Design a protein around this ligand. Structure first.
Ligand SMILES: Nc1nc(C[C@H]2C[C@H](O)[C@@H](COP(=O)(O)OP(=O)(O)OP(=O)(O)O)O2)c(NC=O)c(=O)[nH]1
Ligand SMILES: [Ca+2]
Ligand SMILES: [Ca+2]
Ligand SMILES: [Ca+2]
Ligand SMILES: [Cl-]
Ligand SMILES: [Cl-]
Ligand SMILES: [Cl-]
Ligand code: NA
Ligand code: NA
Ligand code: NA
Ligand code: NA
Length: 326
DNA sequence: CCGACCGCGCATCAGC
DNA sequence: GCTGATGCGC
DNA sequence: GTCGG
């Protein structure tokens, strides 16, 4: 890509601020700067040319000047050399180990994959499954496999109740040739913003997918969100497929368009769009878009019949899923 | 200069 | 047990 | 770290 070297650098800086510094606003600041540079359609020639972009300020402009002249960033070179930063950045790659847990583990002397595998008793349930599938979870999922996964989920949900609708969102819905994981939005007519006329609507679907050996593990599970692990079936004498992360979100059926907008993303796109919503006097979540009054208190939910209706309210021209890949 | 930074589900824990 | 803060995740 | 006011 045109400015791959710059966007990798800013991403690495973002990950540092998140995992090591625990500086969530600097994490987001670097993430925004990398997103704006990633869509910029010219090979960047200077930090001043970059500073023209929104979210690229003086500090990042200087770093870009250093990177263009030398090919590297001294600040990152020292971060890479530091053992405590390096250890924390490694441990956070395990699902369920965050910045706080990573640092506590480093305090206890647990800081390699080997260390973790000797100390399962110190892990909670989520962290133990994340360690179990550490290698698998870092592999990408070819779109071809995403299509077989889709076919299984949709057909099994059909068997439980023909009135369920399951929609695969995330990067898959944005047209990616490969995805980090599978995200399934679920609706059923018995669950609306007005009533829950049936219990266990999510459980019954999880149960069916466990019964056919598609869902293999559970990281977390409540009434409306499932976070777990799944796996495609393999043929005779073939290696098994990698285990994959799956997220399932049950959304009230009358709030589908807000839900599918949220679950399609991207994450940075959602943040940019929600940040822009507030500037226009609205607040958007996965359920509703609501006006902000004179005091800053959210008003009642505005009518939505389409994804486009949401872009309209905040005066954005509609963007197809494939162009929301910020 | 400085306030504000997207919004929320589930798990875990301290205080009562 | 409950509630609110915090951790971690989407 | 960056931005709007
Ligand atoms: N509002 C908001 N939403 C999200 C997650 C949303 C948007 C994302 O497209 C969707 C699924 O998350 P996931 O991590 O699977 O991302 P996805 O875009 O599918 O990428 P990938 O799986 O890595 O190919 O939930 C965020 N997560 C990360 O940015 C976030 O920070 N803010
Ligand atoms: Ca995904
Ligand atoms: Ca996901
Ligand atoms: Ca495996
Ligand atoms: Cl911060
Ligand atoms: Cl909606
Ligand atoms: Cl709401
Ligand atoms: Na700028
Ligand atoms: Na992690
Ligand atoms: Na072991
Ligand atoms: Na197996």
């Amino acid at each position: 890509t045109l400015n791959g070297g710059i966007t990798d650098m800013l991403t690495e800086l973002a990950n540092f601020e998140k995992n090591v510094s625990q500086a969530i606003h600097k994490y987001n600041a670097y993430r925004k700067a990398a997103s704006v540079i990633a869509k910029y359609p010219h090979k960047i020639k200077s930090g001043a040319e970059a500073k023209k972009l929104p979210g690229v300020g003086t500090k990042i402009a200087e770093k870009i000047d250093e990177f263009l002249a030398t090919g590297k960033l001294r600040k990152l070179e020292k971060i890479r050399q530091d053992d405590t930063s390096s250890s924390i950045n490694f441990l956070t790659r395990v699902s369920g180990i965050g910045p706080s847990a990573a640092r506590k583990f480093v305090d206890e002397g647990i800081k390699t994959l080997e260390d973790l595998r000797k100390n399962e008793d110190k892990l909670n349930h989520h962290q133990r499954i994340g360690l179990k599938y550490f290698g698998d979870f870092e592999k990408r999922i070819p779109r071809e496999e995403m299509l077989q996964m889709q076919d299984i989920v949709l057909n099994e949900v059909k068997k439980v109740d023909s009135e369920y609708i399951a929609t695969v969102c995330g990067s898959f819905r944005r047209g990616a040739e490969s995805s980090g994981d599978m995200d399934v939005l679920l609706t059923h007519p018995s669950f609306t913003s007005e009533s829950t006329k049936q219990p266990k609507l999510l459980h019954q679907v999880v149960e069916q997918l466990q019964k056919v050996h598609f869902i293999t593990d559970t990281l977390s599970k409540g009434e409306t969100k499932f976070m777990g692990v799944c796996q495609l079936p393999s043929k005779n004498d073939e290696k098994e497929y990698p285990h994959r992360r799956i997220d399932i979100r049950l959304i009230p059926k009358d709030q589908y368009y807000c839900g599918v907008l949220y679950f399609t993303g991207s994450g940075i796109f959602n943040k940019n769009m929600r940040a822009h919503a507030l500037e226009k006097g609205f607040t958007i979540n996965e359920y509703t878009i609501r006006p902000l009054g004179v005091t800053g208190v959210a008003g009642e939910p505005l009518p939505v019949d389409s994804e486009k209706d949401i872009f309209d309210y905040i005066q954005w021209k509609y963007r197809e899923p494939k162009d929301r890949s910020e």
